[PDB]
Structure 1
Amino acid sequence: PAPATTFAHLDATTVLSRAIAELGIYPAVDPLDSTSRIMDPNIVGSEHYDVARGVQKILQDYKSLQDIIAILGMDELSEEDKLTVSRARKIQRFLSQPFQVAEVFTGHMGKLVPLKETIKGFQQILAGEYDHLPEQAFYMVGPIEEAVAKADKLA
C-alpha cells in the first residue's frame, strides 16, 4: 500500500529492481517499469521518443522469450529472434553506467553521458550497427565511443 499509494504522487518514477542488480547491471533501473510524464514526442522530440520506445519494445520481446530461452535452449530460435536477443542483451549492458560516487568500491571511472550521446548510441545499437562486437563490450562504459574502444581492447 505505501509505494502503490506513492506512485500517483510522482511525475517521474525510477524503479530499481533486484533481478537486474543481481545481473551485475548498475544502476539497477528497471527499463520496463520506469515511466515519466514528459516521455511524449511533443516534448522530448520525435527522435528521442522513437528511440526510447524501440529500446523498451526490444527489451520486452526479450523478456517474453526468457522462458523459451531458459528451457528450450538458445539455438532453437528464429534468426530474427536471435537477432533481437543479441541486440537486447547489448542494450541491457549498455543501459548500465559507472557512477562517480560508486568508484570507491568499484574502481572504474564515473561517466556523465550527455543526452545526445545516449540517443545516438541507442539509435546505433537498435540499427544493428554493432552486431559484431561482443555484448561484453558494453558492460559498464560511458558513451558508445568507449564501448567500441573497449571492444577493440578486448583483443
Structure 2
Amino acid sequence: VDHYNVAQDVVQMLTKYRELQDIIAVLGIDELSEEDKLIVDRARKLVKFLSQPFQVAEVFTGMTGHYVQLDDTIDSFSGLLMGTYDQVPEMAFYMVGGINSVLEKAKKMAEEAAELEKMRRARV
C-alpha cells in the first residue's frame, strides 16, 4: 500500500509541475503563487532524484553505478514529498542512489563551498 500511495503521489506532482511549467515558460517562475513555488521546487528535486548512474554507463557518466533497493526508494521518495528534505540542495539529488547518497553528496558540496569561501577569504 505504501508503494502504491507513494508512486501515485509522485506522479500527481509530476503532473502538477508539467502544468505549471507551461506558465513558467512564458512569464517566469516569479509569476506563480506562494504554494506553487513550493510545488515547483519539490517537483524539480523529484526530477533530479529519478536520475541514477548505472553500473554499465560508468564510462559515459564517469561515476560508480548504484543499486537502489526497493524499500530504500519508497522511503526516500516519501520523505521528499513530505518536505523533510526541503533544506537539501537541488543538485544533491542528481545522479545518486538512495537518500543516504543524497545526504553525502550534500555534505561534499557544502565542504567544497568551504574551499570556495576560505579561499575567498585568503584572496581578500
| TM-score, normalised by the number of residues in structure 1 | 0.69
**C-alpha RMSD over aligned residues:** 0.8
Secondary structure of the residue aligned to 2:61 is: coil
Selected match of 1:116 from 53, 71, 74: 71
Q: Give the ranges of 4+ consecutive aligned residues of structure 1 lying more than 3 Å apart after TM superposition.
A: none
Could you tell me which residue of structure 2 aligns to residue 91 of structure 1? Answer: 46
Corresponding position of 2:22: 67
Asked which structure has the greater RCO (Cα within 8 Å, sep 6+), the reply is 2
Q: Which residue of 1 is the match for residue 35 of structure 2? A: 80
Which among 94, 104, 122 is matched to residue 139 of structure 1? 94
Equivalent position SS for 2:85? coil
Note the C-alpha offset of 1:73: 1.0
Per the normalisation by structure 2, the TM-score is 0.86
Give the partner amino acid of 1:143: G
Matched residue count = 110
**Aligned AA (1:69):** I
Q: Percent identity?
A: 60
Per-residue CA deviations over 1:61-82 (Å, capped at 9, x if unaligned) read: 0001111111111111111111
Distance 1:109 1:77 in 2: 38
Structure with higher helix content: 2
CA distance in 2, matches of 1:105, 1:84: 32
| Structure 2: runs of 5 or more not aligned | 111-124
For 1:138 and 1:144, the matched residues in 2 are separated by: 8
